[PDB]
Scaffold this active site. Structure first.
Site, short mmCIF file in Angstrom:
data_model
loop_
_atom_site.label_atom_id
_atom_site.label_comp_id
_atom_site.label_asym_id
_atom_site.label_seq_id
_atom_site.Cartn_x
_atom_site.Cartn_y
_atom_site.Cartn_z
N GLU A 116 41.44 31.11 51.96
CA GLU A 116 40.29 31.86 52.48
C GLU A 116 39.25 30.54 52.78
OE1 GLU A 116 39.19 34.55 49.07
OE2 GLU A 116 40.04 36.04 50.43
N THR A 172 34.58 36.86 47.49
CA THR A 172 35.30 37.22 48.90
C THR A 172 35.74 38.51 49.11
OG1 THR A 172 37.37 36.38 48.16
CG2 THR A 172 36.08 34.55 48.86
N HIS A 231 44.70 44.88 45.66
CA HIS A 231 44.21 43.67 46.35
C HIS A 231 45.01 42.56 46.31
CE1 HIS A 231 41.47 46.98 47.11
NE2 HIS A 231 40.76 46.82 45.93
N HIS A 276 43.66 34.58 40.14
CA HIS A 276 44.17 35.32 41.29
C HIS A 276 44.42 34.43 42.51
CE1 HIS A 276 39.97 36.12 42.23
NE2 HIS A 276 40.49 36.12 43.58
N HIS A 286 45.12 34.55 46.95
CA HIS A 286 44.97 35.09 48.41
C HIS A 286 46.30 34.25 49.05
CE1 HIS A 286 41.07 36.82 47.31
NE2 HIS A 286 41.30 35.72 46.47
N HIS A 329 42.12 31.19 42.72
CA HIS A 329 40.65 31.71 42.36
C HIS A 329 40.79 31.62 40.74
CE1 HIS A 329 39.57 33.09 46.57
NE2 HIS A 329 39.38 31.54 46.56
C1 LIG Z 1 35.87 35.04 45.45
C2 LIG Z 1 36.74 35.63 44.30
O1 LIG Z 1 37.32 34.67 43.75
C3 LIG Z 1 36.70 36.76 43.66
C4 LIG Z 1 36.27 37.93 44.09
C5 LIG Z 1 36.17 39.19 43.68
C6 LIG Z 1 36.32 39.27 42.16
S1 LIG Z 1 36.24 40.77 41.51
O2 LIG Z 1 35.71 41.94 42.29
O3 LIG Z 1 35.28 40.49 40.40
N1 LIG Z 1 37.62 41.04 40.84
C7 LIG Z 1 38.47 41.88 40.66
O4 LIG Z 1 38.35 43.06 40.20
N2 LIG Z 1 39.88 41.64 41.42
C8 LIG Z 1 40.37 40.61 41.88
C9 LIG Z 1 39.61 39.76 42.53
C10 LIG Z 1 40.07 39.87 44.27
C11 LIG Z 1 41.39 39.39 44.36
C12 LIG Z 1 42.28 39.51 43.24
C13 LIG Z 1 41.83 40.63 42.50
C14 LIG Z 1 36.57 38.25 41.65
C15 LIG Z 1 36.59 37.01 42.09
ZN LIG Z 2 39.71 35.55 45.42
#
Ligand SMILES: CC(=O)c1ccc(S(=O)(=O)NC(=O)NC2CCCCC2)cc1
Ligand SMILES: [Zn+2]
EC number: 4.2.1.1
Length: 257
Positions: A103, A195, A61, A91, A93, A116
């Site tokens: 975003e 998001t 992702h 992380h 986007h 983020h």
């Molecule tokens: C809105 C936002 O900033 C956010 C979205 C999802 C999550 S999550 O689902 O707790 N994290 C993950 O496990 N993955 C990450 C996140 C989404 C892309 C980068 C990878 C954490 C923060």
């Molecule tokens: Zn994010």
């Protein structure tokens, strides 16, 4: 499962995750002229001195820099927040082109990418429990435009060849995230969501007005990453952003006139 393509993209997410059409979804457009300065906002306290990075993960992702959130080492407090929020991970986007990737948008304006810095409320004890709560997370949103290099983003750019495909991960200790911050802590704030799925409505959002400058070469490295896993058809990790969502019954507050 879900993704960013024609067939599994944001507009498809509501099928597996109904809250997608919910009442406090992120991101949103920030109407800078509709947002009210809130005198009652306390100053933002970003305390990242004892910040302990461990690993960098490609999850197919985006990529997460994970931190040791087992004590109060790097914390977000003040501003709109009640209590103490621990940095677990950050992380980005980003876009296929420089004219997109963010975003959140500012007066409909899209940036090249968005950071983020994800923190959780310590009164909930851990991250999984925190996301079940309306005041569970605080995410520090920071916009990236293309221009000057961010020196303190290069260590992250250099190791990305090591985590090219979904699942791959590298040791990534001693990274100082203070080098990713802009000069100004001026910010908009609103009640919002993750998001990505599961799109939980657990986020206090804090988006800084002032973007950081990254080089086209710094963003070009993010685009060389892969959604797919090793040994699979090459799909480039680009446009991993959710478009702006309906603001509904929400006011966006500002920390400044
Ligand atoms: C809105 C936002 O900033 C956010 C979205 C999802 C999550 S999550 O689902 O707790 N994290 C993950 O496990 N993955 C990450 C996140 C989404 C892309 C980068 C990878 C954490 C923060
Ligand atoms: Zn994010």
């Amino acid at each position: 499962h879900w993704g960013y393509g024609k067939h599994n993209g944001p507009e498809h997410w509501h099928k597996d995750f109904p809250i997608a059409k919910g009442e406090r979804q992120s991101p949103v457009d920030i109407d800078t002229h509709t947002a009210k300065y809130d005198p009652s906002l306390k100053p933002l306290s970003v305390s990242y001195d004892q910040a302990t990075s461990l690993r960098i993960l490609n999850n197919g992702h985006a990529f997460n820099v994970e931190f040791d959130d087992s004590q109060d080492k790097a914390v977000l407090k003040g501003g709109p927040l009640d209590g103490t929020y621990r940095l677990i991970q950050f992380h980005f986007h980003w876009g296929s082109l420089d004219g997109q990737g963010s975003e959140h948008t500012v007066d409909k304006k899209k940036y090249a990418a968005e950071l983020h810095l994800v923190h959780w409320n310590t009164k909930y004890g851990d991250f999984g429990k925190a996301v079940q709560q309306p005041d569970g997370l605080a995410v520090l949103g920071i916009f990236l435009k293309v221009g000057s290099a961010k020196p303190g983003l290069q260590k992250v750019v250099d190791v990305l060849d090591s985590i090219k495909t979904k699942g791959k991960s590298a040791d990534f200790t001693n990274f100082d995230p203070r080098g990713l911050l802009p000069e100004s802590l001026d910010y908009w704030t609103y009640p919002g969501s993750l998001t990505t799925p599961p799109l939980l409505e657990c986020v206090t959002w804090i988006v800084l007005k002032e973007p950081i400058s990254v080089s086209s070469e710094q963003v070009l490295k993010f685009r060389k990453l892969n959604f797919n896993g090793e040994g699979e058809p090459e799909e480039l990790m680009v446009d991993n952003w959710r478009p702006a969502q309906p603001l509904k019954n929400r006011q966006i507050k500002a920390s400044f006139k």
